[PDB]
Amino acid sequence: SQIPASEQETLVRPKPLLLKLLKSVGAQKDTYTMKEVLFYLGQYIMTKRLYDEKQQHIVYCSNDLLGDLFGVPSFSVKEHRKIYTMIYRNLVVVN
Amino acid sequence: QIPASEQETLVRPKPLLLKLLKSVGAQKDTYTMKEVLFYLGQYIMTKRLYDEKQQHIVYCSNDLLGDLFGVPSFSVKEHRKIYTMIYRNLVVVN
């Protein structure tokens, strides 16, 4: 019980755009852990084939709601804390 | 061919953070993010900057660490806030 939570155990409430993306891949709740948000976002990119076939770390999301999520027409999966920045801007960390 | 994780990312700490890391016996200029967290944890523990009753509260007023955070205190529970301070104090070797 007295065990501290890691960042991936943080409970979050995605704002409507991020919530819709998570629900589109089968998630059926309004509150998630950061780990579940990362899991479902990766499942979303993969299912919708938004990554470039030849350079698979580049995501092209100009005609997808994911582009609105990031505020850019494309992005790189190598930029770890930039992706966390965009995720945190699309959710409320629950008290 | 194996992609690096965030913890394996190489960084070049800026002068203030570099001084902090070197003060606990780290003797290099390039670090992984894992090493930065390790030596920062060592610094807080060696200088006992935490509140003895609420050990997630770190006090850093009139200290090199308070210069980095731009604040007299912070809580370890707010993971992203700590990463934001660290990234502002380094250059990623990308």
């Binding site: 698979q56 999966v77 | 061919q1």
Partner: peptide, 11 residues
């Protein structure tokens, strides 16, 4: 390297 490998190397 694949998308899934890039994504696994941030869950």
């Amino acid at each position: 390297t694949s998308f899934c490998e890039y994504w696994a190397x941030x869950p």
